[PDB]
Symmetry: D2
Subunit: 247 residues, 4 copies
């Protein structure tokens, strides 16, 4: 069986280095690159694309809100029209670097607060979906299963890719546990790898509030010690005979 391992990257801005792209790229099969709004200045995008290419990592767009200082982690009251234009702008900018390096745009996955706004706001979700569709109808959109975001993406006629989080706790409802909830985030790479295997091999994950829940992981998202977690997860999957490859 196979699964895609994805991680955010190229979020550095100018002189401000961010993340551990060098350590993460050799472990993942796909990367979500920032497009200059919440991170990723032009030179850093070019650098990240070159790194991904060198490591045979598939590159997708990681569009976000126009809030650099806030790293796109803050909710912003953008109109659907503004979301559509901002997403198009970002996808296009990244695609130029991929074109220069002879690589295709693999997917699109919203970043931070935009992602969250999409998961609970139909108009925002629809705007993202239409922007992606208008750019390339064939582009897959990474979404959180069971959300209005997955719904609008499907209604738009886009191919959807289901994401799972081995580092985040799940609730019986099938949705992610609230951030600051005791035990909401799995820190031990060993358990995360354990959970990852389970999600792939069995399509299920333990639930924080009792029992377990079903989850179909087309791709597994990886976050500090991210390299360690990513390492642990990839190894557990490969030692298990699971192929880690871009979706």
């Amino acid at each position: 069986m196979k699964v895609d391992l994805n991680a955010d990257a190229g979020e550095s801005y100018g002189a401000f280095a961010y993340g551990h792209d060098r350590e993460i790229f050799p472990l993942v099969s796909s990367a979500n690159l920032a497009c200059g709004f919440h991170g990723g200045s032009p030179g850093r995008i070019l650098e990240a694309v070159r790194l991904a290419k060198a490591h045979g990592v598939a590159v997708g767009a990681h569009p976000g809100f126009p809030d650099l200082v806030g790293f796109g982690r803050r909710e912003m009251a953008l109109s659907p029209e503004e979301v559509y234009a901002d997403v198009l702008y970002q996808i296009g900018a990244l695609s130029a670097f991929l074109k220069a390096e002879g690589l295709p745009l693999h997917h699109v996955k919203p970043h931070g607060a935009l992602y969250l706004k999409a998961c609970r706001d139909r108009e925002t979700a629809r705007a993202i979906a239409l922007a992606v569709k208008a750019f390339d109808p064939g582009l897959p959109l990474v979404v959180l299963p069971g959300t209005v975001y997955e719904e609008e993406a499907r209604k738009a006629g886009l191919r959807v890719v289901l994401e799972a989080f081995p580092e985040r706790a799940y609730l019986r409802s099938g949705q992610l546990a609230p951030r600051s909830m005791p035990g909401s985030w799995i820190t031990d790479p060993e358990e995360a790898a354990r959970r990852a295997l389970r999600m792939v091999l069995e399509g299920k994950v333990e639930a924080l509030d009792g029992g377990e829940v079903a989850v179909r992981a087309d791709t597994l998202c990886i976050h500090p010690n991210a390299p360690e977690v990513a390492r642990a997860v990839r190894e557990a999957l490969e030692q298990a005979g699971v192929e880690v490859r871009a979706f």
Copy 2:
């Protein structure tokens, strides 16, 4: 005979409306749209592209320095690597809006200080040329004839388009007269139209410092009262039997 009339557009940023796109688009055959660095926020780009499409105007990229407050009119010590990445980023962003609207990217023409830096700096000129070539080898680059900029563009293997300025005075050397030089800028739309016709029909323009100089105008650049000048110029050309069409 035919000639292209081009003007900058889509330079508005957010709530800050700029220029007279509505009045200029029905007069020109090509437009140079800002890409978010010295002007042109995403929503304004989308708006300008829609307007151009409605008026059958060809759209090209107008990349500039990353200096919004300065409107990209200030020289910046960008390394060639930075110029290359910034230009790619901008061309890509604009191309996404054209793709959504089913339009092709017609050309590329640097804006303000970047344009000027290119005209006198070989490394900058080369960086712009390579960025354009890396994105689409078939993209024509608008340049100032007789400059190192035209040279590097040709050395890069790109198709070059020669620009002339009916509103600017020329010197016997064949280059544009210094900005603050007495009589450097033609304000009377009548004379500008007069000069425009001459450049097209005869391939020559009066020189400020005596006599006249040769000029091949594949395209004529148009700037306040820009609409009046553009109007006067287009009419003089059409009443003369000259076809105004995108190059």
Copy 3:
């Protein structure tokens, strides 16, 4: 009797001219100057301060959200800590220009979405109040009467200035009528002037949903045709024997 007439100003950014400061300054007694976040680049701030000084207009800070493209008109999920720091930064920046021109900082009044967030969010309101207090305990804060914003400002120990809007319709509740509600905004300068006089002379204004409501106007806020409205309002007040002066 006397009253202060205030209007926003200095919102231009770089090459992007905004508003009609030249036409408005000779009509108002106080101005709320942008501080570089939603508008007002350094050069434009300096320009606005010089203009105010030339016209003997009192200058206050008009801090907003860090959203230039959105003109600070979009709600942003800033933490109270972030609101506090952003407001301090802005007040300080403007105060430097006033110091250079030998003028005092007259007041503080939040801009756009920040203002609205303050009117309904106690933590945001408190953060603004504390920032102002930390900079100068003696600085008056302009607020909307009957809001949690007025409450937190008073709880913080700051002097509060009550603002009224002759151009906006009021509801019996005493609060402003919703923006897109039929008849929510008074366009006729004559009626606005009429309402303005009433608010000053009688401390009351007609209510959109029947009868009238009480309103104490320490200052009257003025907005396109803003100059006309401002003109009409100031004249109605002066021809009525009401002194227009900074609070």
Copy 4:
């Protein structure tokens, strides 16, 4: 004898942590804090000011060019008017945080390319000097000795503070050796400390191109392994009986 040890700080921007303020502050007597243009977002400024206060470090403004992505390290063709306004804006913004924390603004020292432009351009140097003077005539300006920058500062009537660089090689001319010149930068903290002592105790430093040159160090500037160098330098000075205190 006494001397001031200064280092840049507070350059982090939003989520982008930069430098080693925590390690450097306990070693220096003065810090040059970024003001939001080339680094230092509002929250990070507040954080740096709090840290300095906790460590009894004197805080000065470190104004720079409006080039965040370039970290203010790139030459920009700002007019003297623009330099003046930008510097005022920045000094004012930082002063608000100092006021809130009950601390005075200790000095002003330009950052990166602005600093370099000032050292060779009289109009830029004058603009900086006048901005500082307009804000507070009593504010000392840190300058490079023997430059047009020191000259304009003195002509402006400002108190000037002479800076020396124990980590940079000097030429017989008395000016700093070119960056990429073999041996231009002292990496060994031991030698840097050695040089530092010499500059203080003897007012001289070895010259790269032979012999030595005179240098009066009112303050010593400290830069990766900056903490190590700063540590080595402070210890060498204290073990030598030299008092490290703000000028």
